[PDB]
């Protein structure tokens, strides 16, 4: 149900918070402000849910500490389960073992899922009697068992494999057991009287099971006989393109036959501002294939130099992708918006804040970065814990502020004491005298 969860940066964000008209609410689902950006994200989410288009690349922009990564996390949350979502960093593809093109291809393939469903009969009932006829140093053995439900009760004669199945795991009369006839798996639902009610209705019922596996797993499996281990150890290298083409044809014909359905997902790349020209050139052609997931790209850099080239390009990317990409911009944050963000962060961490404390935290997060206050809140609560009161006061926040330095203050102190610190040229002064 719930995986390993701890209070992180984007724990509070759960969904975009949009209406039926795709008009964002001022404060909903942990999202505050950024009305146009949220509306664009909702449009993209609706496009992904439609699933009738492919190869669409969207780049989000804005200064640091603006919420682009938060917007992507909200998009993932609103996307729900059953739809693949891959979030990777820019530097993740620089693999020493796998080619960068191969890593990008694997990332693209991982975003597309495939659903296959099948019907498996199930037999579940309460054990009445178990009888196993064996022979010491005799070889062949026999067995008989009686199963029971609320409505019906019969004796079943077991095969040779069933004897091993019921003997590998201890099975008694007081156990409630469901077994798949085709699969042969034996499951112990619970323990009856030696506290679970006996199964009702028919003893044997047929139920449908669906297996969801991303396409990249199919490529890895069919790449080599020993490639299945690479699905866990990650040790696969340079899968032949013919394998990918055959897999694409098989997937297309499966979708045509209706045996399986494909679920396009979203590939998210964080800090795309750093990458190589080879990666961009490969993406230019990879986005044009039929099985291209919708790609979201984030970049906080300005007009800088693309890695692998001497010249400086706008937005940190060459114009080739910018021609074929869609740009969503983000704006700064108002003081009231910062106050609401801090309040929602406190509510997420169940920390009680004084009104004056909240106002001064908002003012210092307006002067400094928002992340500074969003981090200082927990330390202020920890300090207030030492005073044996469950409420953060102005004095606690002031003590935390003077205890922990901001970037600008630290820069000023370093500049005032440049002799003490290590110079870029390597010179440093350590003697006090």
């Amino acid at each position: 149900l719930k995986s390993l969860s701890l209070i992180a940066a984007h724990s509070h964000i759960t969904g975009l918070g949009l209406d039926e008209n795709l008009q964002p609410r001022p404060t909903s689902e942990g999202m505050v402000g950024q009305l146009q950006a949220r509306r664009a994200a909702g449009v993209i989410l609706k496009m992904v849910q439609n699933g009738t288009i492919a190869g669409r690349a969207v780049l989000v922009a804005g200064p640091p500490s603006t919420g682009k990564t938060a917007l992507a996390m909200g998009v993932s949350q609103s996307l729900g389960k059953d739809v693949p979502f891959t979030a990777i960093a820019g530097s993740e593809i620089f693999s020493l073992e796998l080619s960068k093109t191969e890593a990008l291809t694997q990332a693209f393939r991982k975003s597309i899922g495939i659903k296959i469903k099948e019907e498996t009969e199930l037999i579940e009932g309460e054990v009445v009697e178990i009888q196993i006829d064996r022979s010491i140093t005799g070889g062949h053995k026999q067995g008989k068992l009686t199963i029971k439900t609320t409505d019906m009760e019969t004796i079943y004669e077991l095969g040779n494999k069933m004897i091993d199945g019921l003997t590998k795991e201890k099975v008694l009369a007081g156990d409630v057991i469901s077994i798949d006839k085709a699969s042969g798996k034996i499951t112990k639902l619970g323990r009856s009287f030696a506290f679970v009610q006996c199964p009702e209705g028919e003893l044997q019922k047929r139920k449908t099971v669906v297996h969801t596996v991303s396409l990249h797993e199919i490529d890895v499996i069919n790449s080599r006989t020993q490639g299945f281990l690479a699905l866990f150890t990650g040790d696969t290298g340079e899968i032949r393109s013919e394998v990918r083409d055959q897999i694409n044809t098989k997937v297309a014909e499966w979708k045509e036959e209706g045996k399986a359905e494909i679920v396009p997902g979203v590939l998210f790349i964080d800090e795309v501002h750093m990458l190589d020209i080879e990666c961009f050139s490969f993406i230019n052609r990879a986005l044009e294939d039929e099985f291209a997931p919708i790609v979201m790209m984030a970049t906080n850099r300005g007009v800088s130099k693309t890695r692998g080239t001497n010249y400086k390009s706008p937005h940190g990317l060459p114009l080739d992708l910018l021609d074929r990409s869609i740009i969503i911009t983000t704006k700064s944050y108002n003081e009231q918006e910062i106050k609401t963000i801090l309040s929602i962060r406190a509510q997420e961490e169940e920390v009680e804040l004084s009104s004056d404390a909240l106002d001064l935290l908002t003012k210092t997060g307006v002067e400094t970065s928002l992340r500074y206050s969003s981090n200082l809140i927990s330390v202020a609560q920890q300090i207030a814990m030492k005073r044996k009161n469950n409420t953060v006061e102005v004095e606690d926040v002031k003590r935390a502020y003077l205890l922990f330095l901001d970037s600008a203050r630290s820069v000023k102190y370093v500049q005032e004491n440049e002799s003490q610190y290590i110079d870029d040229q390597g010179n440093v002064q350590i003697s006090i005298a």
């Binding site: 820019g90 693999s95 800090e271 500074y372 970037s407 003697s431 006090i432």
Partner: protein, 442 residues
């Protein structure tokens, strides 16, 4: 009894919920720094946050690593703590991102507690109990098996279900041999023959174990801990005796591979399932990185991405540089070599240089640690030298004065011994002056 620039730090030197004392736990001065460190210790002990990063910056020989050692000591051995260097991440076998992620996972720990009921003792006898079968038949039917257990200061006999016959036949244990039986799981485990039967043979290849002490029925609770990275590597690495992959691990070289995210998420899911039953108890750790100025810009970007994870533990970074350029970018200039975006994601803790009296106190405390005695005049001379050249030079010079005093058969160092050390052993400044004044390529 060995010391290396440390082991004289015993905790943070704080008090019961207050400002740290002037001298405590081998710490002198820098009250604000260790107060903040204690606040951080309380925060991690809360075990609620995730991905909280702090950074301490200051001049060389200002106790930057000493504070990290102190918080590591204060946390306790049970809490995981992984020291690391900036140069650790550059690995030939696998990309740097994988190594950083592996260290992150190794920082997080996990504790497992289990209770078991044990019935152990010497096998007095094994006698089946006969009963009438529910279904008519001429064959023998057994309803219970009687086993007697003998131990020191207590013996007992147990009546068990007859299904224990398979286990008792498998263990090949007959009579007068100590066995172990679990209450609910059943089954039996032979541990060795009773020591009383050792003399029965002139020679023996089989050891004899003494009878268990105390009652035959025991209730012991066992606690085991392991980090998440160990679970991941055990899941990924195959094991076995004769399966083909088993000696495919042989005749080859096992090397680090980029573990997939699906394996990590499966491990997380099973860990969550087990912890929902109360058997498990997750404890986050602390990752310590030194000379963080030496990290590549790509590693900095991956750190920025990873710090927002829901399982990322608390990391602590140290840097002794100021206005420098981040490695991998010739134009970007940021304080301490950390890119500005990463600095925006953490908290900066300042560190201040020491004074002459603090230097003298440090020297005297180190001398007490090193089990050697100095005179007041020699101590003052050493403090003046440390304030002149550097603190670390004075700290290093201690052992040569002890050796020189030992050569002169003296127990305490005098001014003459420290003068002999100063003329025999040079510091950085005199060496640099000699290099400047010499043209022999020295």
């Amino acid at each position: 009894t060995r010391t290396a620039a440390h082991t004289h730090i015993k905790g943070l030197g704080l008090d019961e919920s207050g400002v740290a004392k002037r001298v405590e736990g081998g710490f002198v001065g820098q009250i604000e720094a260790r107060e903040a460190c204690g606040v951080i210790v309380d925060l991690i002990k809360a075990k609620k946050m995730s991905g909280r990063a702090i950074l301490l910056a200051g001049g060389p020989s200002t106790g930057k690593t000493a504070l990290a050692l102190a918080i590591s000591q204060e946390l306790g051995p049970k809490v995981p703590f992984c020291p690391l260097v900036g140069s650790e991440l550059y690995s030939v076998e696998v990309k740097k991102t994988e190594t950083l992620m592996e260290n992150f996972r190794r920082a997080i720990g996990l504790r497992i507690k289990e209770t078991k009921e044990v019935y152990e003792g010497e096998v007095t006898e094994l006698t089946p109990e006969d009963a009438e079968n529910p279904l008519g038949g001429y064959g023998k039917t057994i309803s219970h098996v009687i086993v007697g257990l003998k131990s020191a200061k207590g013996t007992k006999t147990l009546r068990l279900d007859p299904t224990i016959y398979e286990s008792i036949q498998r263990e090949k244990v007959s009579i007068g041999d100590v066995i172990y039986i679990e209450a609910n799981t059943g089954a039996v485990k032979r541990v060795g023959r009773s020591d009383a039967y050792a003399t029965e043979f002139d020679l023996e290849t089989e050891e004899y174990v003494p009878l268990p002490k105390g009652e035959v029925h025991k209730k012991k609770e066992i606690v085991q801990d392991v980090t998440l990275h160990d679970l991941d590597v055990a899941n990924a690495r195959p094991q076995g005796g004769q399966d083909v992959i088993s000696m495919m691990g042989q005749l080859l070289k096992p090397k680090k591979t980029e573990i997939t995210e699906k394996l990590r998420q499966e491990v997380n899911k099973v860990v969550a399932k087990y912890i929902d039953q109360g058997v498990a108890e997750l404890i986050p750790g602390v990752l310590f990185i030194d000379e963080v100025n030496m990290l590549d810009i790509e590693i900095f970007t991956y750190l920025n991405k990873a710090l927002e994870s829901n399982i990322a533990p608390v990391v602590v970074l140290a840097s002794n540089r100021g206005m420098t350029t981040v490695r991998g970018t010739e134009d970007v200039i940021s304080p301490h070599g950390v890119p500005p975006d990463l600095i925006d994601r953490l908290l900066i803790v300042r560190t201040l240089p020491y004074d002459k009296d603090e230097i003298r106190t440090i020297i005297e405390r180190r001398a007490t640690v090193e089990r050697l005695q100095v005179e007041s005049s020699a101590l003052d001379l050493l403090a003046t030298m440390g304030t002149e050249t550097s603190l670390r030079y004075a700290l290093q010079l201690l052992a040569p004065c002890g050796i020189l005093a030992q050569t002169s058969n003296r127990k305490e160092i005098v001014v003459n011994d420290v003068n002999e050390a100063k003329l025999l052993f040079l510091d950085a400044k005199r060496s640099t002056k000699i290099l400047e004044t010499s043209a022999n390529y020295l």
